[PDB]
Amino acid sequence: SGAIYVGNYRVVNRHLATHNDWANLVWEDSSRDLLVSSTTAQGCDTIARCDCQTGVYYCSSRRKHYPVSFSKPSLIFVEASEYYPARYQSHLMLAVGHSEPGDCGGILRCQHGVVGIVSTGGNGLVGFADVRDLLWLDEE
Ligand SMILES: COc1ccccc1CC(=O)N(C)CCC(N)=O
Ligand SMILES: COc1ccccc1CC(=O)N(C)CCC(N)=O
Ligand SMILES: [Zn+2]
């Protein structure tokens, strides 16, 4: 589990969104596994605006923050799960690292701010849903 809190926005994995998130929906994209809902209180996170490929992510299944190198956001085939059938997930970045299903929502950060959240994994890989292209998160 986990979320990004920037401005009056809450960014979560679309497959983990709550019924309050859906009732207060701002934007969602199934192909990205992302959902953004509105919040009453202001958050403290800053979104990175960069092309960094190195950073640190939080892994709840190890209670550890791991430095990683990750690929640029791209269209990657993701096997069937209890949340989605087998499909192509877009804006996804991969790294060699540990992850388990409940690690989704763990933040990946670089020196500029939040880069994305854990969204997929398996076979010693961890996938992050990128949020750096969502410029509108920084305003209104
Ligand atoms: C100190 O947190 C670091 C540091 C490096 C890298 C990542 C984090 C995690 C983070 O930014 N959180 C707000 C924790 C909640 C979450 N959703 O992961
Ligand atoms: C961190 O996720 C891991 C890790 C290891 C093994 C399995 C998972 C769960 C996982 O990949 N999904 C539920 C897919 C979600 C999606 N974005 O389509
Ligand atoms: Zn950066």
Side-chain angles (χ1 to χ4, degrees):
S1 69
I4 307 163
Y5 294 95
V6 50
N8 286 270
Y9 295 127
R10 170 168 137 97
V11 188
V12 297
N13 289 94
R14 189 193 187 269
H15 72 277
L16 300 181
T18 72
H19 290 185
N20 185 68
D21 285 324
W22 283 105
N24 293 288
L25 177 61
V26 172
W27 169 84
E28 55 83 20
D29 183 333
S30 184
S31 76
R32 292 180 66 154
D33 184 43
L34 286 183
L35 182 143
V36 176
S37 59
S38 54
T39 69
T40 64
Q42 279 200 227
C44 302
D45 285 311
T46 287
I47 307 302
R49 299 302 179 195
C50 65
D51 61 359
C52 284
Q53 281 188 255
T54 65
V56 177
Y57 79 106
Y58 177 60
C59 176
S60 66
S61 68
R62 292 286 182 271
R63 294 180 183 131
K64 201 142 162 60
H65 303 255
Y66 291 109
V68 283
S69 295
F70 54 94
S71 65
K72 284 179 168 174
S74 74
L75 189 69
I76 295 294
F77 191 69
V78 174
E79 297 290 321
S81 69
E82 63 164 307
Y83 301 102
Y84 301 101
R87 80 211 206 283
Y88 288 88
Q89 175 162 327
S90 61
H91 301 264
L92 186 64
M93 301 172 292
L94 298 183
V96 173
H98 183 68
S99 68
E100 300 177 40
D103 286 327
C104 289
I107 280 165
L108 169 66
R109 289 185 181 274
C110 66
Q111 75 188 86
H112 308 108
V114 173
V115 172
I117 51 172
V118 175
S119 177
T120 75
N123 294 332
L125 300 152
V126 52
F128 307 97
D130 186 57
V131 301
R132 300 174 288 183
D133 67 315
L134 304 172
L135 311 184
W136 55 268
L137 288 175
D138 298 341
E139 69 236 26
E140 109 96 356

